[PDB]
Coordinates of C-alpha atoms and ligand atoms in Angstrom, one line a residue:
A1 CA -59.2 215.6 78.1
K2 CA -57.1 214.1 75.4
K3 CA -53.4 213.4 75.9
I4 CA -51.4 214.5 72.8
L5 CA -47.7 214.4 72.0
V6 CA -46.7 216.5 69.0
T7 CA -43.3 216.9 67.3
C8 CA -41.8 218.4 64.2
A9 CA -38.8 217.1 62.4
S10 CA -35.5 217.5 64.2
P11 CA -33.3 220.2 62.5
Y12 CA -29.8 219.2 61.5
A13 CA -27.2 220.6 63.8
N14 CA -24.9 221.7 61.0
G15 CA -27.1 224.4 59.6
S16 CA -29.0 227.5 60.7
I17 CA -32.8 227.7 60.9
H18 CA -34.4 229.2 57.7
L19 CA -37.9 230.2 56.5
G20 CA -38.4 226.6 55.4
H21 CA -37.9 225.2 58.9
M22 CA -40.2 228.0 60.2
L23 CA -43.1 226.9 58.1
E24 CA -43.1 223.5 59.8
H25 CA -42.6 224.8 63.3
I26 CA -45.1 227.5 63.0
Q27 CA -47.8 225.2 61.5
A28 CA -47.3 222.8 64.4
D29 CA -47.3 225.5 67.0
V30 CA -50.6 227.0 65.8
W31 CA -52.1 223.5 66.0
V32 CA -50.6 222.9 69.4
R33 CA -51.8 226.2 70.8
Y34 CA -55.3 225.6 69.6
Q35 CA -55.3 222.1 71.2
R36 CA -54.2 223.6 74.5
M37 CA -57.0 226.2 74.2
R38 CA -59.5 223.4 74.0
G39 CA -58.2 222.0 77.3
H40 CA -56.2 219.0 76.2
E41 CA -52.9 217.7 77.8
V42 CA -50.4 218.6 75.1
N43 CA -46.7 217.9 75.0
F44 CA -44.9 219.7 72.1
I45 CA -41.3 218.5 71.8
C46 CA -38.4 218.5 69.4
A47 CA -34.6 218.0 69.4
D48 CA -31.6 218.8 67.3
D49 CA -30.4 216.0 64.9
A50 CA -26.7 216.1 65.9
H51 CA -25.1 212.9 64.6
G52 CA -23.3 211.9 61.3
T53 CA -20.3 212.2 59.1
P54 CA -21.0 215.8 57.9
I55 CA -21.1 217.0 61.5
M56 CA -18.0 215.0 62.5
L57 CA -16.1 216.6 59.6
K58 CA -17.3 220.1 60.2
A59 CA -16.2 220.0 63.8
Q60 CA -12.8 218.8 62.8
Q61 CA -12.5 221.6 60.3
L62 CA -13.4 224.1 63.0
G63 CA -10.9 222.7 65.4
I64 CA -13.5 222.0 68.1
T65 CA -15.1 218.9 69.5
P66 CA -18.4 217.9 67.9
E67 CA -20.0 218.2 71.3
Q68 CA -19.0 221.9 71.5
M69 CA -20.2 222.6 68.0
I70 CA -23.6 220.9 68.3
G71 CA -24.1 222.6 71.6
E72 CA -23.6 226.0 70.0
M73 CA -26.0 225.3 67.1
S74 CA -28.5 223.9 69.6
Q75 CA -28.5 227.2 71.4
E76 CA -28.8 229.2 68.1
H77 CA -31.7 227.0 67.0
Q78 CA -33.5 227.4 70.3
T79 CA -33.0 231.2 70.3
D80 CA -34.6 231.4 66.8
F81 CA -37.6 229.2 67.7
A82 CA -38.1 231.1 71.0
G83 CA -38.0 234.3 68.9
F84 CA -40.9 232.9 66.8
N85 CA -42.8 231.8 70.0
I86 CA -42.7 228.1 69.1
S87 CA -44.1 226.8 72.5
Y88 CA -42.0 223.7 72.9
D89 CA -42.4 221.9 76.3
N90 CA -38.9 220.4 75.7
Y91 CA -36.1 220.8 73.2
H92 CA -33.5 218.1 73.5
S93 CA -30.8 216.5 71.4
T94 CA -30.3 213.2 69.5
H95 CA -26.9 213.2 71.2
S96 CA -28.1 212.4 74.7
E97 CA -28.1 209.6 77.2
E98 CA -31.9 209.2 76.8
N99 CA -31.5 208.6 73.0
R100 CA -28.5 206.4 73.5
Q101 CA -30.4 204.0 75.8
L102 CA -33.6 204.1 73.7
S103 CA -31.6 203.5 70.5
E104 CA -29.8 200.6 72.0
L105 CA -33.0 199.2 73.4
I106 CA -34.9 199.4 70.1
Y107 CA -32.0 197.9 68.2
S108 CA -31.7 195.1 70.7
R109 CA -35.4 194.3 70.5
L110 CA -35.3 194.4 66.7
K111 CA -32.3 192.0 66.7
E112 CA -33.9 189.6 69.1
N113 CA -37.1 189.6 67.0
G114 CA -35.1 188.7 63.9
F115 CA -35.3 192.0 62.1
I116 CA -31.6 192.7 61.8
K117 CA -29.5 191.2 59.1
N118 CA -25.7 191.2 58.4
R119 CA -24.2 191.6 55.0
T120 CA -20.9 192.8 53.5
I121 CA -21.0 195.7 51.1
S122 CA -18.3 197.5 49.0
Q123 CA -17.9 201.2 49.3
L124 CA -15.5 204.0 48.4
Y125 CA -12.9 204.4 51.1
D126 CA -10.3 207.2 51.7
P127 CA -7.1 205.3 52.7
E128 CA -5.2 208.4 53.8
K129 CA -7.9 209.9 56.1
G130 CA -8.9 206.3 56.9
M131 CA -12.7 206.5 56.5
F132 CA -15.5 205.4 54.2
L133 CA -16.9 208.2 52.1
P134 CA -20.6 209.0 51.7
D135 CA -21.4 209.9 48.1
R136 CA -21.2 213.7 48.5
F137 CA -17.6 213.4 49.8
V138 CA -16.3 212.0 46.6
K139 CA -15.5 214.3 43.7
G140 CA -14.0 213.8 40.3
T141 CA -14.5 214.0 36.5
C142 CA -18.0 213.3 35.0
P143 CA -17.8 210.0 33.1
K144 CA -20.1 211.3 30.4
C145 CA -19.1 214.9 29.5
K146 CA -15.7 214.8 31.2
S147 CA -16.3 218.0 33.2
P148 CA -13.9 218.2 36.2
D149 CA -14.6 218.6 39.9
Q150 CA -18.1 217.2 40.0
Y151 CA -19.4 216.0 43.4
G152 CA -21.3 212.8 44.3
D153 CA -23.8 211.0 42.0
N154 CA -24.5 213.8 39.5
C155 CA -22.9 216.2 37.1
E156 CA -23.9 219.9 37.4
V157 CA -22.8 220.6 33.8
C158 CA -24.4 217.9 31.6
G159 CA -26.9 216.7 34.2
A160 CA -25.9 213.1 34.1
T161 CA -26.5 210.8 37.2
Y162 CA -24.3 207.9 38.1
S163 CA -22.7 206.1 41.0
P164 CA -19.7 208.0 42.4
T165 CA -17.7 204.8 41.6
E166 CA -18.1 205.9 37.9
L167 CA -16.2 209.2 38.5
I168 CA -13.0 209.5 36.5
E169 CA -9.9 210.3 38.7
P170 CA -11.9 210.3 41.9
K171 CA -10.7 212.4 44.8
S172 CA -11.7 212.4 48.5
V173 CA -13.3 215.7 49.3
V174 CA -11.7 215.3 52.8
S175 CA -8.1 214.7 52.0
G176 CA -7.7 214.8 48.2
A177 CA -6.5 211.2 48.2
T178 CA -7.7 208.7 45.6
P179 CA -10.4 206.6 47.2
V180 CA -10.7 202.8 46.5
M181 CA -13.4 200.2 47.0
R182 CA -13.3 198.5 50.3
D183 CA -15.4 195.8 52.0
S184 CA -17.3 196.4 55.2
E185 CA -19.9 194.4 57.2
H186 CA -23.2 196.3 57.6
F187 CA -26.3 195.8 59.6
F188 CA -29.7 196.0 57.9
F189 CA -33.2 196.5 59.2
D190 CA -35.7 194.2 57.6
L191 CA -38.3 196.8 56.5
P192 CA -39.8 194.3 54.0
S193 CA -41.1 192.2 56.9
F194 CA -43.5 195.1 57.8
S195 CA -44.9 195.5 54.3
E196 CA -48.4 194.3 55.0
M197 CA -48.8 196.3 58.2
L198 CA -47.6 199.4 56.4
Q199 CA -49.9 198.9 53.4
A200 CA -52.8 198.4 55.8
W201 CA -52.0 201.7 57.5
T202 CA -51.7 203.4 54.2
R203 CA -55.2 202.4 53.2
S204 CA -56.7 203.1 56.6
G205 CA -57.6 206.6 55.6
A206 CA -55.7 208.4 58.4
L207 CA -52.9 209.8 56.2
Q208 CA -53.3 212.6 53.7
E209 CA -54.4 211.4 50.3
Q210 CA -51.3 212.7 48.6
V211 CA -49.1 210.9 51.1
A212 CA -50.9 207.6 50.7
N213 CA -50.6 207.9 46.9
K214 CA -46.8 208.4 47.3
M215 CA -46.5 205.4 49.6
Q216 CA -48.3 203.3 47.0
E217 CA -45.5 204.2 44.6
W218 CA -42.9 203.0 47.1
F219 CA -44.7 199.7 47.7
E220 CA -44.9 199.3 43.9
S221 CA -41.1 199.8 43.5
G222 CA -40.6 197.4 46.4
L223 CA -39.4 197.8 50.0
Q224 CA -35.8 196.9 50.7
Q225 CA -33.7 196.1 53.7
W226 CA -32.3 199.3 55.2
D227 CA -28.5 199.8 55.8
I228 CA -28.5 201.1 59.4
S229 CA -24.8 200.9 60.3
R230 CA -21.8 203.2 59.7
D231 CA -18.1 202.5 60.3
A232 CA -15.8 204.5 62.6
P233 CA -14.7 207.2 62.6
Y234 CA -18.2 208.5 63.2
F235 CA -20.0 210.9 65.6
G236 CA -22.9 208.9 67.0
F237 CA -23.8 205.8 69.0
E238 CA -21.7 202.7 68.9
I239 CA -23.5 199.5 68.2
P240 CA -23.5 197.0 71.1
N241 CA -21.3 194.0 70.5
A242 CA -20.0 195.4 67.3
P243 CA -16.7 197.3 67.8
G244 CA -16.1 200.0 65.3
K245 CA -19.7 200.1 64.1
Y246 CA -22.2 202.9 64.7
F247 CA -25.9 203.4 64.2
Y248 CA -26.6 205.5 61.1
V249 CA -27.8 208.9 62.1
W250 CA -31.3 208.3 60.5
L251 CA -31.9 205.3 62.8
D252 CA -31.3 207.3 66.0
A253 CA -32.9 210.5 64.7
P254 CA -36.6 209.7 65.2
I255 CA -35.8 207.8 68.3
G256 CA -34.4 211.1 69.5
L257 CA -38.0 212.3 69.7
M258 CA -38.8 209.5 72.1
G259 CA -35.6 210.5 74.0
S260 CA -36.8 214.1 74.2
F261 CA -40.0 213.0 75.8
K262 CA -38.2 210.7 78.2
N263 CA -35.9 213.7 79.1
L264 CA -38.9 215.9 79.7
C265 CA -40.6 213.3 82.0
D266 CA -37.4 212.7 83.9
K267 CA -36.8 216.4 84.5
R268 CA -40.4 216.7 85.7
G269 CA -40.0 213.7 88.1
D270 CA -42.8 212.1 86.2
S271 CA -42.3 208.3 86.2
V272 CA -45.5 207.3 84.5
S273 CA -46.1 209.4 81.4
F274 CA -43.4 208.0 79.2
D275 CA -45.0 204.5 79.2
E276 CA -48.5 206.0 79.0
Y277 CA -47.6 207.7 75.7
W278 CA -45.3 205.1 74.2
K279 CA -46.4 201.6 75.2
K280 CA -48.5 199.6 72.7
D281 CA -51.7 199.9 74.8
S282 CA -51.5 203.7 74.9
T283 CA -54.6 205.8 74.6
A284 CA -52.6 208.9 74.0
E285 CA -52.3 210.5 70.6
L286 CA -48.9 210.9 68.7
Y287 CA -48.5 213.3 65.8
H288 CA -45.5 214.3 63.7
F289 CA -45.4 217.5 61.6
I290 CA -42.9 216.8 58.8
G291 CA -41.9 217.9 55.3
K292 CA -42.4 215.7 52.2
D293 CA -38.6 215.1 51.8
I294 CA -38.5 212.8 54.9
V295 CA -41.9 211.0 54.5
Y296 CA -40.1 207.7 53.5
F297 CA -38.3 207.7 56.9
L298 CA -41.3 208.7 59.1
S299 CA -44.0 206.7 57.3
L300 CA -42.1 203.4 56.5
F301 CA -38.9 203.0 58.6
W302 CA -40.3 204.6 61.8
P303 CA -43.6 202.8 62.2
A304 CA -41.8 199.5 61.4
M305 CA -39.0 200.2 64.0
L306 CA -41.7 200.9 66.6
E307 CA -43.8 197.8 65.8
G308 CA -40.7 195.6 65.9
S309 CA -39.6 196.9 69.3
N310 CA -43.0 196.8 71.0
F311 CA -43.9 200.5 71.0
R312 CA -47.0 202.3 69.7
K313 CA -46.9 203.9 66.3
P314 CA -47.8 207.4 65.2
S315 CA -51.5 208.3 65.3
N316 CA -50.9 210.4 62.2
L317 CA -48.3 212.2 60.1
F318 CA -49.1 215.8 59.0
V319 CA -47.1 216.6 55.9
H320 CA -46.4 220.1 54.5
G321 CA -44.9 221.3 51.2
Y322 CA -41.8 223.4 50.4
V323 CA -41.6 227.1 51.1
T324 CA -41.0 229.3 48.1
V325 CA -40.2 233.0 48.1
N326 CA -41.7 235.2 45.3
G327 CA -42.9 232.0 43.6
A328 CA -39.5 230.2 43.4
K329 CA -37.2 228.1 45.5
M330 CA -35.2 230.2 47.9
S331 CA -32.3 231.8 46.1
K332 CA -29.1 233.0 47.8
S333 CA -28.1 235.2 44.9
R334 CA -31.5 236.9 45.0
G335 CA -31.4 237.2 48.7
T336 CA -34.5 235.1 49.2
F337 CA -32.7 232.3 51.2
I338 CA -33.7 233.9 54.5
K339 CA -32.6 232.8 57.9
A340 CA -35.0 232.9 60.8
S341 CA -32.6 235.1 62.8
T342 CA -32.3 237.6 59.9
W343 CA -36.1 237.8 59.6
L344 CA -36.5 238.9 63.2
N345 CA -34.2 241.9 62.6
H346 CA -36.7 243.2 60.1
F347 CA -40.1 242.0 61.0
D348 CA -41.9 240.5 64.0
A349 CA -42.7 236.8 64.4
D350 CA -46.5 237.4 64.2
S351 CA -46.3 238.7 60.7
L352 CA -44.8 235.5 59.3
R353 CA -46.9 233.3 61.5
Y354 CA -50.0 235.0 60.1
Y355 CA -49.0 234.9 56.5
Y356 CA -48.1 231.2 56.6
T357 CA -51.3 230.4 58.4
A358 CA -53.4 232.3 55.9
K359 CA -51.8 230.1 53.1
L360 CA -51.7 226.7 54.9
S361 CA -54.1 223.9 54.3
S362 CA -54.5 220.1 55.0
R363 CA -52.6 219.4 51.7
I364 CA -48.9 219.0 51.0
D365 CA -48.7 221.7 48.3
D366 CA -45.9 224.3 48.5
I367 CA -46.4 227.5 50.4
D368 CA -45.4 230.8 48.7
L369 CA -44.1 233.8 50.6
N370 CA -44.7 236.5 48.0
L371 CA -43.0 239.5 49.6
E372 CA -45.2 242.2 47.9
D373 CA -48.3 240.2 49.0
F374 CA -46.9 239.8 52.5
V375 CA -46.8 243.6 53.0
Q376 CA -50.3 244.0 51.5
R377 CA -51.9 241.1 53.4
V378 CA -50.4 241.9 56.8
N379 CA -51.4 245.6 56.5
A380 CA -54.9 244.8 55.2
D381 CA -55.8 242.0 57.5
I382 CA -54.0 242.6 60.8
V383 CA -53.8 246.4 60.9
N384 CA -56.9 247.3 58.9
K385 CA -59.4 244.5 59.7
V386 CA -58.7 243.0 63.1
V387 CA -56.7 245.5 65.1
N388 CA -58.7 248.4 63.6
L389 CA -61.6 247.3 65.7
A390 CA -59.6 248.1 68.8
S391 CA -57.7 251.1 67.6
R392 CA -60.7 253.0 66.2
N393 CA -62.8 252.5 69.4
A394 CA -60.4 252.4 72.4
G395 CA -59.6 256.1 72.3
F396 CA -63.2 257.3 72.9
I397 CA -63.7 254.7 75.7
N398 CA -60.5 255.8 77.5
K399 CA -61.0 259.6 77.0
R400 CA -64.7 260.0 77.4
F401 CA -65.8 257.0 79.5
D402 CA -62.9 256.5 81.9
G403 CA -62.0 253.3 80.1
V404 CA -65.3 251.6 81.0
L405 CA -67.2 249.5 78.5
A406 CA -71.0 249.7 78.2
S407 CA -73.2 247.7 80.5
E408 CA -74.9 245.8 77.6
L409 CA -74.2 244.7 74.0
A410 CA -75.5 247.3 71.5
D411 CA -76.1 244.5 69.0
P412 CA -76.6 241.1 70.7
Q413 CA -77.7 239.5 67.4
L414 CA -74.4 240.5 65.7
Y415 CA -72.4 239.3 68.7
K416 CA -74.2 235.9 68.4
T417 CA -73.2 235.6 64.8
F418 CA -69.6 236.0 65.9
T419 CA -69.8 233.4 68.7
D420 CA -71.8 231.0 66.6
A421 CA -68.8 230.8 64.3
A422 CA -66.6 229.2 67.0
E423 CA -67.6 225.6 66.0
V424 CA -66.6 225.9 62.3
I425 CA -63.5 227.9 63.1
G426 CA -62.3 225.5 65.7
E427 CA -63.0 222.6 63.4
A428 CA -60.8 224.3 60.8
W429 CA -57.9 224.7 63.2
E430 CA -58.4 221.1 64.3
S431 CA -58.3 219.7 60.7
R432 CA -55.3 221.9 59.8
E433 CA -57.4 223.9 57.3
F434 CA -55.7 227.0 58.4
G435 CA -56.5 229.0 55.3
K436 CA -60.2 228.3 55.8
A437 CA -60.1 229.4 59.4
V438 CA -58.4 232.7 58.5
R439 CA -60.9 233.3 55.7
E440 CA -63.8 232.7 58.2
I441 CA -62.2 235.0 60.8
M442 CA -61.5 237.8 58.2
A443 CA -65.1 237.5 56.9
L444 CA -66.2 238.2 60.4
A445 CA -63.8 241.1 60.7
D446 CA -65.4 242.5 57.6
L447 CA -68.8 242.3 59.2
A448 CA -67.4 244.0 62.3
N449 CA -65.9 247.0 60.4
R450 CA -69.2 247.2 58.4
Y451 CA -71.0 247.5 61.7
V452 CA -68.7 250.3 62.9
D453 CA -69.2 252.2 59.6
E454 CA -73.0 251.7 59.8
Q455 CA -72.8 253.4 63.3
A456 CA -70.3 256.0 62.2
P457 CA -68.7 256.8 65.6
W458 CA -66.7 259.6 64.0
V459 CA -70.0 261.3 63.4
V460 CA -71.7 260.3 66.7
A461 CA -68.7 261.7 68.6
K462 CA -69.3 265.3 67.5
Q463 CA -73.1 265.4 68.1
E464 CA -74.7 266.8 71.2
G465 CA -76.1 264.4 73.8
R466 CA -75.0 261.2 72.0
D467 CA -72.4 260.1 74.6
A468 CA -74.4 257.0 75.5
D469 CA -74.6 256.1 71.8
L470 CA -70.8 256.5 71.4
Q471 CA -70.0 254.3 74.3
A472 CA -72.4 251.6 73.1
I473 CA -71.0 251.6 69.6
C474 CA -67.3 251.6 70.6
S475 CA -67.9 249.0 73.3
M476 CA -69.6 246.7 70.7
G477 CA -66.6 247.1 68.4
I478 CA -64.2 246.1 71.2
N479 CA -66.2 243.0 72.1
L480 CA -66.1 241.9 68.5
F481 CA -62.3 242.4 68.7
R482 CA -62.2 240.2 71.8
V483 CA -63.9 237.4 69.9
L484 CA -61.7 237.7 66.8
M485 CA -58.5 237.8 68.8
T486 CA -59.6 234.6 70.6
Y487 CA -60.0 232.8 67.3
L488 CA -56.5 234.2 66.3
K489 CA -54.8 233.5 69.6
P490 CA -53.1 230.3 68.3
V491 CA -51.8 232.3 65.3
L492 CA -50.6 235.6 66.9
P493 CA -49.1 235.0 70.4
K494 CA -47.5 238.4 70.9
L495 CA -50.4 240.6 69.5
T496 CA -52.6 238.4 71.7
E497 CA -50.6 239.3 74.8
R498 CA -50.9 243.0 73.9
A499 CA -54.7 242.5 73.3
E500 CA -55.1 240.8 76.7
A501 CA -53.3 243.6 78.5
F502 CA -55.6 246.1 76.8
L503 CA -58.8 244.1 77.6
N504 CA -57.6 243.2 81.1
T505 CA -58.5 239.6 80.6
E506 CA -57.0 236.3 79.4
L507 CA -58.6 235.1 76.2
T508 CA -60.1 231.6 76.5
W509 CA -62.1 229.7 73.8
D510 CA -65.2 229.4 75.9
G511 CA -64.9 232.9 77.4
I512 CA -66.3 234.6 74.3
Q513 CA -69.8 233.4 75.5
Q514 CA -69.5 236.1 78.2
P515 CA -69.0 239.5 76.6
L516 CA -67.1 242.3 78.5
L517 CA -69.7 244.5 80.1
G518 CA -69.2 247.3 82.7
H519 CA -65.6 246.4 82.3
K520 CA -62.4 248.5 82.6
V521 CA -59.9 248.4 79.7
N522 CA -56.4 249.9 79.6
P523 CA -54.9 252.5 77.2
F524 CA -52.4 251.3 74.7
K525 CA -49.5 252.6 72.5
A526 CA -50.2 250.9 69.2
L527 CA -51.2 247.2 69.0
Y528 CA -49.7 246.7 65.6
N529 CA -47.9 248.9 63.1
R530 CA -47.9 248.9 59.3
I531 CA -45.0 247.4 57.3
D532 CA -43.7 248.5 53.9
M533 CA -41.7 247.4 50.9
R534 CA -38.7 249.4 52.0
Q535 CA -38.4 247.0 54.9
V536 CA -38.7 244.0 52.6
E537 CA -36.0 245.3 50.3
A538 CA -33.8 245.7 53.3
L539 CA -34.5 242.1 54.4
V540 CA -33.5 240.9 50.9
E541 CA -30.3 243.0 50.8
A542 CA -29.3 241.7 54.3
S543 CA -29.8 238.1 53.1
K544 CA -27.6 238.3 50.0
Ligands
LIG1 C1 -36.2 212.7 63.1 S1 -36.5 213.9 61.8 C2 -34.9 214.2 61.2 C3 -34.9 215.2 60.1 C4 -33.6 215.5 59.4 N1 -32.7 216.1 60.4 C5 -33.8 216.5 58.3 O1 -33.7 217.7 58.5 O2 -34.1 216.2 57.3
ZN2 ZN1 -21.2 215.6 32.9

């Protein structure tokens, strides 16, 4: 009955999707699929973050228009997300008419409300190329150790940090020309004006404890005005009434989420939902699944921008940690920096979805993809605990009972134990305590396989006149499988489809209250196969 709008962070258009991105999109998708299972109106949307100096320069280097380049990466990104079954209702772009109009609208409202200031700053400028240089586009000699060819604000030899203006014999990364300091008028967003409102939100109890604690650090350091303009040449939106000035990519980026929803509503011919979800009096819920590296933007700048332009603010922010492989940050040399596209050449999407889900929680701690454990866990839990309930019982039903399940539950009490667990498991999905949900589900799977072993169908099957017993036992196992797959439906979309084909029924959350009795099931190849370390080693090799 609830109206919910969910988004993830918008991936940058100048890079491919990797396992880090996938943790976020998978976490959000599991939550979204669960919400849909409970009957809510859900809108899951995203967009590619396509503006900025890096993108402009990359396109120039490739000899193509930025429009062509971002279009190609958008398609690549969407192919990867589709491959992992991320159920987006809309995937748009920050480079769109919807975002242009909303960005100009919000800026105009902020300016009229007195939240935009003008001030001149001094910045390194490449006079040959004719453009201001962001820090990482300046290279030179470290002022401390004198090591050559260091980029930006830090030295990778001695570890010193400094303003690029301190680099000795500075060179433009773009042209090789010597940059010089040049003045430029910039527009600033008055974030400090929203300090009290933001502090009140921080102590409201909605945000994760770890996020609130971090925000207190930011309030202690002191909020500052935010430089939201960038000079031409740039790839982005030009600021109204300010020739040669553009909105900094980070200003239009989150607005692009609003733009994606407007685009969805417009394509649907829906003229009422946009305002119903974004106006101040909205009763709809808005959630953003994001990584800790962008919390400053989504928890401080974003709510302030919305407040200042008369729009509703996020109902909550769901923050996740970094993704490590084998305990450490992804390493290109070790072949642990894995692309989403590469992953799918070696494993299915469900395997990673399951592993991440089993490790996820409501906290912002990092999630480790230990490859050896990945093989062990997928084989133990998916193949040997859950799918085993179907694979060890389906054969007898199809071969000796014409595919028809028993007319009654052999063990109603045990079945009730399984359905009684729905409340706690659903609450775990709801609260994002994914690891807890998986543990509960697997504990039930253990009870199910214990039941089958207690009944010993491999013994019953060879004994005279025990056909009724065999059908009863195997049917019971299949019904337990039906329940477990329902609880896991948000996690394993593809295996779920195969399970539904086998069971001849769509799995619904409430449906488990009615077991399958005197019901025809279909034969199947193999619902899920084992994986091994040889496959893992091949994945790593292919990633080097
Ligand atoms: C509106 S969220 C933008 C996120 C940004 N593109 C990043 O990857 O960090
Ligand atoms: Zn140095």
